[PDB]
Amino acid sequence: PPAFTELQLPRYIMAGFPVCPKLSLEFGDPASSLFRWYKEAKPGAAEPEVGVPSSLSPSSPSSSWTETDVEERVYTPSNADIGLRLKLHCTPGDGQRFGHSRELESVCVVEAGPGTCTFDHRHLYTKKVTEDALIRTVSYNILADTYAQTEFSRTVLYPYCAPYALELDYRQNLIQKELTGYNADVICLQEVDRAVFSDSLVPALEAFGLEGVFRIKQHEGLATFYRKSKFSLLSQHDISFYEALESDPLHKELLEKLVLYPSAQEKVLQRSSVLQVSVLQSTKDSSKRICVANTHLYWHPKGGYIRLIQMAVALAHIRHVSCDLYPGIPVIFCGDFNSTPSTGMYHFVINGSIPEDHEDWASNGEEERCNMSLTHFFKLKSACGEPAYTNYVGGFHGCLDYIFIDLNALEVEQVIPLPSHEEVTTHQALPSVSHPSDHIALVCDLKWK
Ligand SMILES: Cn1c(-c2c[nH]c3cc(C#N)ccc23)nc2ccc(C(=O)N3CCO[C@@H](c4ccccc4)[C@@H]3CO)cc21
Ligand SMILES: [Mg+2]
Numbered sequence: 001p002p003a004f005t006e007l008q009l010p011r012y013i014m015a016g017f018p019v020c021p022k023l024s025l026e027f028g029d030p031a032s033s034l035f036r037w038y039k040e041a042k043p044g045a046a047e048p049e050v051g052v053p054s055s056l057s058p059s060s061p062s063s064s065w066t067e068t069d070v071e072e073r074v075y076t077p078s079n080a081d082i083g084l085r086l087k088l089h090c091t092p093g094d095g096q097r098f099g100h101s102r103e104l105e106s107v108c109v110v111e112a113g114p115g116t117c118t119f120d121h122r123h124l125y126t127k128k129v130t131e132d133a134l135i136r137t138v139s140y141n142i143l144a145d146t147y148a149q150t151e152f153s154r155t156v157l158y159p160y161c162a163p164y165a166l167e168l169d170y171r172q173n174l175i176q177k178e179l180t181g182y183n184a185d186v187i188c189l190q191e192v193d194r195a196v197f198s199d200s201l202v203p204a205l206e207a208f209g210l211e212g213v214f215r216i217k218q219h220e221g222l223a224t225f226y227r228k229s230k231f232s233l234l235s236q237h238d239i240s241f242y243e244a245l246e247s248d249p250l251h252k253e254l255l256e257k258l259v260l261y262p263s264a265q266e267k268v269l270q271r272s273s274v275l276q277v278s279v280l281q282s283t284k285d286s287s288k289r290i291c292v293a294n295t296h297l298y299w300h301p302k303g304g305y306i307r308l309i310q311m312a313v314a315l316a317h318i319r320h321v322s323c324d325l326y327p328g329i330p331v332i333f334c335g336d337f338n339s340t341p342s343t344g345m346y347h348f349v350i351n352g353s354i355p356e357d358h359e360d361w362a363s364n365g366e367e368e369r370c371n372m373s374l375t376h377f378f379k380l381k382s383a384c385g386e387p388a389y390t391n392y393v394g395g396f397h398g399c400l401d402y403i404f405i406d407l408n409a410l411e412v413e414q415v416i417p418l419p420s421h422e423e424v425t426t427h428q429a430l431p432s433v434s435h436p437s438d439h440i441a442l443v444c445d446l447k448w449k
Helices: 119-123 151-157 168-181 194-207 241-247 249-258 262-269 304-325 344-351
Strands: 003-008 022-026 034-040 065-067 086-091 102-105 134-141 186-192 210-216 221-227 231-236 274-282 289-296 331-336 380-382 401-406 410-415 442-448
Touching: 003 102, 022 194, 119 168, 134 289, 134 331, 134 401, 168 194, 186 194, 186 210, 186 289, 186 331, 194 210, 194 221, 210 231, 210 274, 221 231, 221 274, 221 289, 241 249, 241 262, 241 274, 241 304, 249 262, 249 304, 262 304, 274 304, 289 304, 304 331, 304 344, 344 380, 401 410, 401 442
Parallel strands: 134 186, 289 331
Antiparallel strands: 003 022, 034 065, 034 086, 086 102, 134 442, 186 221, 210 221, 231 274, 274 289, 331 401, 380 401, 410 442
């Protein structure tokens, strides 16, 4: 019979933010599920019930719960719901019949939420899922809780941020609203904690028709979500840069240059950055396949040469996947590259070459110097161009994030505008009560050329 193996409500609920249940189904179809939301009739009206003998069971359903008109999986509370607990009544189905109906109450009440978030204005451009000819693509470093909880992040990096707004539950509510509100097709995320993927992103995004894949780095990792109605996952080709550089003959030539600089070599091989690669097939035209890559490069401000080497590994691996394993399919390469447009790594991506005398070959000092020349054959451009910044914190700001696209195979139809400098600095810098990351999500609508 159709039955829920998992059924969970969020730990924290805010007015104007979606309540996304976590559910797992056995012997049933997800499109057959029935939902009905209830809210307390008054703040504190519903007292949790103890078990009573069946002969003294209630003669009528409790007057402490009010039936809402919401029959959707996701419920967004209004400000009129502040102080109420919620209750979801749901039934699993297989298309022919229904399993036993289930009920679940929230532990928390609906809290007041921020009156405005930076993505509200941006959401005015993404009210609908794009037409079959487009690919709405997102790239976003969502700031891992493993880092945000440290004393260094709380008191050194983000001391201006309201401490409650840096907490996982608050930021996950904002991130869930932000991402679902973009109505996107391809979502590439960085700094995804394992529990954030399983308990926050998967429940929210699967309710809006997206499926995700996760790749760990060390303490957090990368996620790629894709809209099931527009794409199917064909194959995965994830790598760790240090493993691929040392073991794979694809990077043979690069390693020959690097071994001439033992100090620079050791530094690169001790980095744990990974590359997530997913080959997707269009559900509308099976002849249209896309290679979606996602990364998070070395963070250090003076790590220029390391990012150059990691990018050189990434592009050689992407070449192999998109041009050897597949017959020259278009590339979408998202990430937090930790590289501004005036750097060597960015010059290398856009120009297809970098000379050996670039200042970035000595970015971390003389001991770790590794002058070399590099080339790649891809014709790539930044889909959202070069914003003034994509990362804005008290101590630094810069354009670090990109959606790189094969400029011969894809073109940009729309760039969802980033918040203004005034809006970004409302609470001095990021994150804030109104913005759930130190980075700003890149969103664009792409089309096949
Ligand atoms: C991008 N960036 C620069 C920076 C400043 N100027 C730049 C210019 C370029 C360029 N081009 C690249 C980077 C920077 N300085 C930074 C300092 C900190 C972090 C940070 O928040 N993290 C890195 C260390 O690991 C994590 C962490 C661990 C423990 C505690 C807190 C965080 C976290 C992951 O993203 C990022 C910075
Ligand atoms: Mg960070």
